[PDB]
Write a protein that binds this ligand. Structure first.
Ligand SMILES: CC(=O)N[C@@H]1[C@@H](O)[C@H](O)[C@@H](CO)O[C@@H]1O
Ligand SMILES: CC(=O)N[C@@H]1[C@@H](O)[C@H](O)[C@@H](CO)O[C@@H]1O
Ligand SMILES: CC(=O)N[C@@H]1[C@@H](O)[C@H](O)[C@@H](CO)O[C@@H]1O
Ligand SMILES: CC(=O)N[C@@H]1[C@@H](O)[C@H](O)[C@@H](CO)O[C@@H]1O
Ligand SMILES: CC(=O)N[C@@H]1[C@@H](O)[C@H](O)[C@@H](CO)O[C@@H]1O
Ligand SMILES: CC(=O)N[C@@H]1[C@@H](O)[C@H](O)[C@@H](CO)O[C@@H]1O
Ligand SMILES: CC(=O)N[C@@H]1[C@@H](O)[C@H](O)[C@@H](CO)O[C@@H]1O
Ligand SMILES: CC(=O)N[C@@H]1[C@@H](O)[C@H](O)[C@@H](CO)O[C@@H]1O
Ligand SMILES: CC(=O)N[C@@H]1[C@@H](O)[C@H](O)[C@@H](CO)O[C@@H]1O
Ligand SMILES: CC(=O)N[C@@H]1[C@@H](O)[C@H](O)[C@@H](CO)O[C@H]1O
Ligand SMILES: CC(=O)N[C@@H]1[C@@H](O)[C@H](O)[C@@H](CO)O[C@H]1O
Lengths: 324, 160, 324, 160, 324, 160
């Protein structure tokens, strides 16, 4: 009669590493590293993302012609640009503080678009129609942005305009506008008459004045002229006031912003589907409860910690010695 | 083995026993068999489980984290941001990989210690009534039955 | 006859945690986490802090009326703003590079205030008195900043002024000044005469020229006009030179700065007392030799490392088994 | 216990002994008592003390650290600064909490090992002159006095 | 007959530290901390560094007189400034976005210098010679930068110039230029005639216009006048176009840049030698395979990790007990 | 010693033995001598070597890293950059110093365990044929020769 003391063992082939020895087979273990994904851009908490497709933030907000699809959008869980998001500023120029605008948009979950300055109403004495170019063509004909209005002299009569708006929305209002810089002094005449005009925007915290800088510059999309775009967030109660005498690409539509958190802009060419997730990445959605992941550093939602590791297996059982 | 038991004075494991990690064999007239010790196996389990949960706790989950953009005259700032992102990434990777490496060593030794402790818990019970052979097996002098084997894999026994 | 080997034990109820088990009672242990404080803003190395109370950095330096208490101050261990530090720029406008000025002040331990351009002396041909407004009222009447001088035309006669100063202090000199922007062309007349005047400051490293930007802006503190404030650190030896023809809110008092380290600006509503400490935080002063603290990330002096932990107890004794 | 002694083959502790952490009991004609072993207890103390000082050393004290301000057009930069501050804070918290967790485990095992080592330091002295009972107590064969007990809790003894 | 079990031991005197005890002597160990160096600035992968000696980045690129030695250079492994690199902007003024230029240069491994606008060819109607000053003297006489040309009126006749360049190099072209600001209106006359002239540079992404800001400023190197330097990287294909009517310090030489990685600018007074290394630092070159170093945080090449440690010795053998 | 062997029940080391870290003495008629155990010594070596390589692996080498410059109106940004650089430096220094400190403790205990395990590997072979004296030496009863000593420092022996 005898009795022996021993320990479990099996056919397991999982291996872990230790400081003293590599590739040790153990009886049981757990993986802490998630490396698999959805392959698709999904919904976060029911709401779906906002594709810009061929458009970029600039195009979308400004109202570039090709981005009419986006016109109807009002809420999203995260904004998505792609490898071919080049439809934005159709008429050459500069978008002052563009990056800071994007950063602002990263904490906006939804807004309400509204005609701040009605085309046919807020502009008598000044001529509304006939403010288009080939640079921003449509269907084949010439056109312009759907949110900005190009005011030109009404029969060699460009009086000094002064329009204002009061923020009565209880939210923040995003106001965008532009300033034109014709190539030759001749054109200044034919567009706003007055040889030396000016534009002046102002509110409680904002104050800035612009003056045309006519000159000779290379052609971009068949244009030696330029156009700088601007923006600012009008606070609740405050009043913004434009006052120009030519060159003022005026605000036609504005947005009342809803600040939400945990949203953001991403660049991905992955297909959008009717799928819901708790963690999204540019490569696809993730669904794990593991502590780490090596899929992508860019994240939206609640994800595992990004890490460069290839393998992270933690032993639980003991050294597996079959000795069969 | 830091404790000389597993893959040590007890050369190998029993692919047979499947009730836990540590147990007894036993060869009494009435027949042979295997039986895992709940006492031991359950404690090891509770510990290891607690360890894995503790490791996952210290690693808070990551929330939204998107990139930033910079114009062609914000290069220094762009790289500072780049330096920060890469720096944190190196550290977390280092921490994660190291913790696992170090804790794995600790786990394997834990088991080795557990096995060794069971052996000497039995050995101190028998004493004279049996003799130490090899591979951690004891050979009874007073040849005992199944009713007795259950006093061994229990701690009752009694017989200096 | 017998003899036994054993280990100490007691009534201790302190518990520590381990990776394998939580809440284990031990015989002895030490706490490494400091979580108690003074509740008061104290002195650091004898010197007391500088309260701004109802004032902010802008008010203090500019000389806003309500901040007369601060006029006598010259040295401090750290600057303190509160929840009601709104007395600064009384006359609407902008404070160019304000944040950078604050950053500079964070390494200033003391200075010497001195009338750089004496009111009655450096300004003949130009009229000193009568440069006040209701925006910066005092006792009920209208007034202005105590360190800046508002020069206005001396009987429709605003000649081209040109004043200079040489830094003979062996230190750095902080020079502050402003530029006024009247609402209507009419006012430009009534204030500095000349319809189109200008201001031009310059030194060895500094060079900039300003021009009035008259326009129509909402009323702030009953004012449609504006005023931009500026500053610069004049190096030892160099010379700063103002040259204006109207709109120049001139430098009346300046400061010679003493650079000290380990100082800074903080926001706190905690009471200041005659108490000395080695570590101060917005919640109060700390007095510990523990390695960590979870009181506040903001620190001045020599403190423990801020951490989010709730508990940090390290075992020293052994597992406490009373078995009474 | 990783070493099977504390809360192991020596079931509990002596609320009585108050001269140190490890000691002896002793029951000789002349009477009973408790006596801690300086040799053991002092070493454990020196070690533990050295450990606690080493842990506090690696954590340099924090000097002045105040916030920074940003205008409404320095959002990216404001957040970069925010990202940096939070990132360092996560790491230090993680390091502090983990070091304590890991070292606590190591300390408890240290004591367990110390106790077990003392037991076997005595056991190898006696040998035949006494027999191993339970709870780490030895029963003398040649019944010895207080003058002898002091040769045991000293290492002198001598008597194969 | 007997047999004993024991362990090695020796005369080793190396000591390591542990959490429980300090200064423990062991039989064997390895040092992980590198603390020795070359003391010399060496070559990296065959190529040698570029010393600026008495010059700085500004001097070098602009062509300051004293930096003629550098004129012949075209490739380097890393740029080196010293404690006396003060020869740069000889004629007082400002170098807009200077730091960003340096950052750009940090990823440039070589370039091709080329006369973009030949002195005698691209400038008829305008007078080339006679554009020198004492501020930038040479051999004793007055002179100017070798890459920039100072255009002055050709007999009270300063016509409106307009020159252009097309980037046909397949690389990036670094174009530098300046704008002069005379002290008195009188000088404006004597230099470019036209009382109110202007300068206007422009390309596809660049667009900016300058206007002289004449005034009175302290003397620097015997000069109350100023001169601002500018730069921009012209993309492949694009065209840059200058158009001025006076005050335009014109581009004479430009550079086609070769982007390389792992290069950079450093400040050191260590001697350059004909030595090759894989890791360079301002204190000298390092040659180790150890994981850490405490020589210098600034590094170029492949080096050990900088660390503040004084000692890092890892035990390998056992506690050494000679017991001789 | 966590395992009571080195600088423990085996008081000191043999400056003589130079074939490895662990070995045997032996005093047979034919003469004395020292002989290291390859089995033991080689394993310790392989481990320790693996440890040192693993520690150096986790520390990726540093590539180009030069400073940045800021004008007198970029102070906040200059300090942010300063905060980042110092922050990373503190952490790496802490990590490096701590890993070495902790692993050193682990290495010394490794050896102690190795020694203790060899002792008990021999002790279980002999048994009755010799008696345990001190300093980990066994005294033969059946006095054996050099041909026999080689069956001991080999594991063959055989003689319950
Ligand atoms: C190159 C490497 O990673 N080594 C191990 C190898 O030694 C082992 O036999 C195999 C299976 O466990 O896994 C890996 O290939
Ligand atoms: C409305 C507008 O901006 N037109 C352009 C179009 O000409 C171009 O082909 C496309 C992609 O390059 O971007 C925009 O859609
Ligand atoms: C843990 C347990 O099952 N206890 C019982 C014990 O009470 C009993 O005396 C013995 C034989 O009857 O069997 C078991 O050891
Ligand atoms: C001179 C000045 O700007 N001080 C203002 C004061 O006018 C105002 O009434 C008070 C309430 O907001 O704030 C500050 O004390
Ligand atoms: C003392 C004074 O000038 N009155 C103003 C008052 O009109 C205003 O409502 C308040 C808050 O902005 O600040 C000041 O108290
Ligand atoms: C530590 C010490 O004081 N040593 C002595 C010891 O040598 C002696 O054998 C014993 C009994 O007389 O008394 C003391 O314990
Ligand atoms: C300091 C000392 O003990 N000297 C000897 C040295 O002469 C010899 O070369 C070495 C190896 O044989 O061992 C010791 O280092
Ligand atoms: C070899 C070495 O590092 N010297 C130290 C010495 O400075 C220190 O005083 C002593 C005790 O702490 O230990 C070592 O001898
Ligand atoms: C060509 C030029 O810029 N001249 C100066 C020179 O006068 C001065 O002595 C030197 C150092 O002080 O720097 C520059 O070389
Ligand atoms: C004479 C001259 O050229 N001006 C300065 C001079 O004040 C200084 O002594 C010299 C040598 O360092 O450096 C020059 O820049
Ligand atoms: C840079 C240096 O001096 N280090 C030398 C290297 O030149 C040499 O090629 C190599 C060959 O073993 O040995 C290194 O120590």
């Amino acid at each position: 009669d005898t009795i022996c003391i021993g320990y479990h063992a099996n056919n397991s082939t999982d291996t872990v590493d230790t400081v003293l020895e590599k590739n040790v087979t153990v009886t049981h273990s757990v993986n802490l590293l998630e490396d698999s994904h959805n392959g698709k851009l999904c919904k976060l908490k029911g709401i779906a993302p906002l594709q810009l497709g061929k458009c970029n933030i600039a195009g979308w907000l400004l109202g570039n012609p090709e981005c009419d699809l986006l016109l109807t959008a009002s809420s999203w869980s995260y904004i998505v640009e792609t490898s071919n998001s080049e439809n934005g500023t159709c008429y050459p120029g500069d978008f002052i503080d563009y990056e800071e605008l994007r950063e602002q948009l990263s904490s906006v979950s939804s807004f309400e678009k509204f005609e701040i300055f009605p085309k046919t109403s807020s502009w008598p004495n000044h001529e509304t129609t006939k403010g288009v170019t080939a640079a921003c063509s449509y269907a084949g004909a010439s056109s312009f942005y759907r949110n900005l209005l190009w005011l030109t002299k009404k029969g060699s009569s460009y009086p000094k305009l002064s329009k204002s708006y009061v923020n009565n929305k209880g939210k923040e209002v995003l106001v965008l506008w532009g300033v034109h810089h014709p190539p030759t002094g001749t054109d200044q005449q034919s567009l706003y008459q007055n040889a030396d005009a000016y534009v002046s925007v102002g509110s409680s915290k904002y104050n800035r004045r612009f003056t045309p800088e006519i000159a000779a510059r290379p052609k971009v999309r068949d244009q030696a002229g330029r156009m700088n775009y601007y923006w600012t967030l009008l606070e609740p109660g405050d009043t913004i006031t434009f006052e120009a005498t030519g060159n003022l690409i005026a605000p036609w539509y504005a947005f009342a912003l809803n600040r939400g958190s945990g949203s953001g802009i991403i660049t991905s060419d992955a297909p959008v589907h009717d799928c819901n997730t708790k963690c999204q990445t540019p490569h696809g959605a993730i669904n794990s409860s593991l502590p780490f992941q090596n899929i992508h550093p860019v994240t939206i939602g609640e994800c595992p910690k990004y890490v460069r590791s290839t393998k992270l297996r933690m032993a639980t059982g003991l050294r597996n010695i079959p000795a069969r | 083995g830091l404790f000389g038991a597993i893959a040590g004075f007890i050369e190998g494991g029993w692919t047979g026993m499947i009730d836990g990690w540590y147990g007894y064999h036993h060869q009494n007239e009435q027949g042979s068999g295997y039986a895992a010790d709940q006492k031991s196996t359950q404690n090891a389990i509770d510990g290891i489980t607690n360890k894995v949960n503790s490791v996952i706790e210290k690693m808070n989950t990551q929330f939204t984290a998107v990139g930033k953009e910079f114009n062609n005259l914000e290069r220094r700032i762009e790289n500072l941001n780049k330096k920060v992102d890469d720096g944190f990434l190196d550290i977390w990777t280092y921490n994660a990989e190291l913790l696992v490496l170090l804790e794995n060593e600790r786990t394997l030794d834990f088991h080795d210690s557990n096995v060794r402790n069971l052996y000497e818990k039995v050995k101190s019970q028998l004493k004279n009534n049996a003799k130490e052979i090899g591979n951690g097996c004891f050979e009874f002098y007073h040849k005992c039955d199944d009713a007795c084997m259950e006093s061994v894999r229990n701690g009752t026994y009694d017989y200096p």
